[PDB]
Design a protein around this motif. Structure first.
Motif, PDB file in Angstrom:
ATOM      1  N   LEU B  11      -3.661  -6.628  -7.816  1.00 23.48           N
ATOM      2  CA  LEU B  11      -2.599  -6.928  -8.768  1.00 23.48           C
ATOM      3  C   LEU B  11      -1.466  -7.735  -8.146  1.00 23.48           C
ATOM      4  CD1 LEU B  11      -2.497  -3.432 -10.517  1.00 23.48           C
ATOM      5  CD2 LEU B  11      -3.491  -5.549 -11.423  1.00 23.48           C
ATOM      6  N   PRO B  13       1.071 -10.633  -7.212  1.00 18.02           N
ATOM      7  CA  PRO B  13       1.534 -11.754  -8.052  1.00 18.02           C
ATOM      8  C   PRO B  13       0.926 -13.101  -7.689  1.00 18.02           C
ATOM      9  CG  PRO B  13       3.377 -10.423  -7.261  1.00 18.02           C
ATOM     10  CD  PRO B  13       2.176  -9.972  -6.503  1.00 18.02           C
ATOM     11  N   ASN B  14       0.564 -13.318  -6.425  1.00 24.45           N
ATOM     12  CA  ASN B  14       0.026 -14.600  -5.990  1.00 24.45           C
ATOM     13  C   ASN B  14      -1.497 -14.595  -5.902  1.00 24.45           C
ATOM     14  OD1 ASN B  14       0.129 -12.810  -3.821  1.00 24.45           O
ATOM     15  ND2 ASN B  14       0.455 -14.433  -2.307  1.00 24.45           N
ATOM     16  N   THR B  15      -2.154 -13.653  -6.576  1.00 22.48           N
ATOM     17  CA  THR B  15      -3.610 -13.607  -6.571  1.00 22.48           C
ATOM     18  C   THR B  15      -4.181 -14.843  -7.257  1.00 22.48           C
ATOM     19  OG1 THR B  15      -3.664 -11.185  -6.546  1.00 22.48           O
ATOM     20  CG2 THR B  15      -5.624 -12.328  -7.342  1.00 22.48           C
ATOM     21  N   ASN B  38      -4.501  -8.269 -13.376  1.00 21.41           N
ATOM     22  CA  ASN B  38      -3.413  -8.584 -14.279  1.00 21.41           C
ATOM     23  C   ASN B  38      -3.948  -9.319 -15.507  1.00 21.41           C
ATOM     24  OD1 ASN B  38      -0.801  -7.622 -13.327  1.00 21.41           O
ATOM     25  ND2 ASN B  38      -1.180  -8.886 -11.509  1.00 21.41           N
ATOM     26  N   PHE B 157       3.426  -0.372  -6.787  1.00 22.14           N
ATOM     27  CA  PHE B 157       4.603  -1.186  -6.501  1.00 22.14           C
ATOM     28  C   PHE B 157       5.862  -0.341  -6.353  1.00 22.14           C
ATOM     29  CE2 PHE B 157       3.059  -5.529  -6.879  1.00 22.14           C
ATOM     30  CZ  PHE B 157       1.850  -5.348  -7.517  1.00 22.14           C
TER      31      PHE B 157
END
Lengths: 222, 216
Positions: B11, B13-15, B38, B157
């Motif tokens: 998960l 953010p830069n995946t 996501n 997170f």
């Protein structure tokens, strides 16, 4: 002149309670901050508390802080926030799509928010500088300009790093005078904020806005 | 086979797309319970695992802060199901729970359940690291009354992840009627087995390959 009019009074912690939102809005009226920035569940409360404070805008965050939902959801959350009383929205870009050079999806993602906010709210595009290469920071700003956004913004405050003077100067160089540039994440004192202003920032995102303004007042006192 | 209880999660953010491809092929190889991605990646994961109905596509709702409106959470759920998701993990309104606003917490969960009704499982992330013991109990009870299918420890997170005492507390509240998912901080087989022995029926992790490879 006062730095407070350039500060977004931000509180986005997941465990934020109503009493903390009430205090944040009251601080914004006292210091005449540019806005309060709260999560979408608190927009209706902020707008009611500031309904007679027209110079203090209600700002919320969209697809925040990961930016990895669909453009359709970001537009719906934008429209929903505007109905609840938000007059500024800060969206997070699809960082993964930007990493994959899927520029048409990044732009359509931004444009979905801009179209929902059209004529009703300012849109700020959070590019999340701590996760981008130099070329990606420039591409993200260019897509924000092409999409009709009003601001480019450095950081969510939930990633590894925050605003840097070099990033702000980079962003200001791309957008020129046409879009605002917002320095957020890690802006803790007046020294930080003034450094970002000098680098070209026109709005400051911070949680220590009271300490920043009080530091500005201390330069005039004995 | 502990692999059938693992949600192969990624998960960040830069995946990127190649990482989702690697995630899905690993899950179809080890027959994981699901991949958790996501919402932007749901349509891709559903097509990459079209020929693997045993591996579901899981996504996250109002994630990871839980501080958006119930109408947005419901729209995101419906949008996720249209894109191919069959399990949704939503985050509670933590501030509403801490303010004793129990009707809003339940209505918020209820919005996702109705969107997912008959199409997807709903997992309710209560974020144990920000909750007192009583709020942990109340969150599970509100999940049961709203009709969720799972209670989940953590978003991945926050500052804390699943603990055995948290898993046992949640299992005691929901009993056998809802699943209990241990997520956050589980890195080996010994952690995964400790959560399962505490009452968890699903494991959320990123090192599911290293866990299953230790079943020798």
């Amino acid at each position: 002149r006062s730095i407070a009019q350039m500060i977004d009074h931000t509180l986005l912690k997941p465990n934020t309670t109503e009493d903390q939102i009430v205090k944040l809005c009251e601080e914004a009226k006292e210091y005449s901050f540019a806005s309060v920035c709260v999560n979408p569940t608190w927009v209706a409360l902020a707008a009611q508390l500031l309904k007679d404070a027209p110079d203090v805008k209600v700002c919320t965050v969209i697809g925040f802080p990961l930016g990895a939902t669909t453009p359709e959801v970001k537009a719906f959350e934008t429209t929903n926030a505007i109905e609840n009383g938000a007059t500024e929205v800060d969206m997070v870009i699809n960082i993964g799509a930007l990493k994959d050079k899927q520029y048409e999806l990044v732009g359509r993602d931004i444009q979905a928010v801009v179209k929902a906010a059209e004529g009703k709210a300012l849109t700020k595009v959070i590019i999340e500088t701590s996760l981008l290469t130099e070329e990606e920071k420039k591409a993200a700003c260019e897509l924000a300009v092409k999409a009709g956004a009003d601001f480019v913004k450095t950081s969510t405050g939930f990633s590894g790093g925050g605003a840097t003077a070099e990033d702000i100067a980079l962003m200001r160089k791309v957008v020129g005078p046409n879009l605002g540039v917002l320095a957020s994440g890690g802006v803790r004192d007046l020294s930080d904020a003034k450094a970002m202003i000098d680098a070209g920032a026109t709005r400051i995102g911070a949680s220590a806005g009271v300490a920043i303004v009080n530091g500005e007042r201390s330069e005039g006192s004995y």
